[PDB]
Amino acid sequence: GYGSWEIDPKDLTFLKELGTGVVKYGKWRGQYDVAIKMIKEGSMSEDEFIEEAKVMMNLSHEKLVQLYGVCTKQRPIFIITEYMANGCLLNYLREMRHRFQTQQLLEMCKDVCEAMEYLESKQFLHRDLAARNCLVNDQGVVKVSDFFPVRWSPPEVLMYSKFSSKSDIWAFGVLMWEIYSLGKMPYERFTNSETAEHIAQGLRLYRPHLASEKVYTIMYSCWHEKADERPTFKILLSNILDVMDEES
Ligand SMILES: CCN(CC)CCOc1ccc(Nc2ncc3cc(Oc4ccc(F)cc4)c(=O)n(C)c3n2)cc1
């Protein structure tokens, strides 16, 4: 048993499909908006499901998509999370520009940075940080979810498979760039193969027009060739707050 995490499936009402594992929008006990993830039989393993669910049971933060419970005494198994009304951040940046101004781009960055500082403090590596893996709620708050993506990877990952806190740092820099470019694909004119070659040669993503020099300095610091020279999420958060105060 998963203790207080076990949800009675009778308390769920299904309303709309969100993506297809099948994810749906619904309500829990007719009061709370939820997303219901229906893991289809055959995918994953005995141990694989147990790990990932318990990962979500042990991590909790205002800027991380929150697990509400699990339905495991039946097939298919349900995962129930908080509902993020505005969907995927990547689509939001591309399709919902009428809902946010330039000043709010930095706020999106801060939201993600707070999530990552928390994960960092728990010694938990995300390993796939990108706009496509963040969600946006009804108030426009960005939250990290889902805790090969060549375009989000540092040279040591691409060359040596060296994952660390510092590869998450690199990816976060790329995410800032996604936000400030309003959802452009990083290295937009290159293939993954070309991106890898260019990164290793010291090529870096250009400053998006919407990013000030100070904002660019923040994302650029994430891309130091030397992993040990990249900041921590604690440092990035302080930097972001400093720029927020100076630019508003
Ligand atoms: C107009 C077309 N529209 C159809 C209505 C397209 C869909 O637009 C939307 C609209 C709202 C959402 N919101 C939304 N909210 C919560 C979750 C939780 C999920 O499970 C997790 C599982 C693990 C985890 F770590 C975090 C969350 C998950 O998977 N997805 C997707 C979610 N999507 C997502 C997409």
From Swiss-Prot:
Subcellular location: Cytoplasm; Cell membrane; Nucleus; Membrane raft
Record key words, sorted: Acetylation, Adaptive immunity, Apoptosis, ATP-binding, Cell membrane, Cytoplasm, Disease variant, Dwarfism, Immunity, Innate immunity, Kinase, Lipid-binding, Membrane, Metal-binding, Nucleotide-binding, Nucleus, Phosphoprotein, SH2 domain, SH3 domain, Transcription, Transcription regulation, Transferase, Tyrosine-protein kinase, Zinc, Zinc-finger
Modified residues (Phosphotyrosine): 206
Binding locations of dasatinib: 81-84
Residues spanned by motif CAV1-binding: 170-177
UniProt-annotated catalytic positions: 128
Effect of residue 230 to H: In XLA; severe
Binding site for clofedanol: 81-84
Tissues and organs where the protein is expressed, per its UniProt entry: Predominantly expressed in B-lymphocytes.
Mutagenesis / variant outcome for changing residue 183 to E: In XLA; mild; interferes with substrate binding
Protein kinase domain ranges (all copies): 12-244
Record's function text: Non-receptor tyrosine kinase indispensable for B lymphocyte development, differentiation and signaling. Binding of antigen to the B-cell antigen receptor (BCR) triggers signaling that ultimately leads to B-cell activation. After BCR engagement and activation at the plasma membrane, phosphorylates PLCG2 at several sites, igniting the downstream signaling pathway through calcium mobilization, followed by activation of the protein kinase C (PKC) family members. PLCG2 phosphorylation is performed in close cooperation with the adapter protein B-cell linker protein BLNK.
Domain-level remarks: The PH domain mediates the binding to inositol polyphosphate and phosphoinositides, leading to its targeting to the plasma membrane. It is extended in the BTK kinase family by a region designated the TH (Tec homology) domain, which consists of about 80 residues preceding the SH3 domain.
Subunit structure of this chain's protein: Part of a complex composed of EEIG1, TNFRSF11A/RANK, PLCG2, GAB2, TEC and BTK; complex formation increases in the presence of TNFSF11/RANKL. Binds GTF2I through the PH domain. Interacts with SH3BP5 via the SH3 domain. Interacts with IBTK via its PH domain. Interacts with ARID3A, CAV1, FASLG, PIN1, TLR8 and TLR9. Interacts with MPL/TPOR.
Protein name: Tyrosine-protein kinase BTK
Organism listed in the record: Homo sapiens
GN (gene name): BTK
Residues of the full protein shown: 391 to 659 of 659
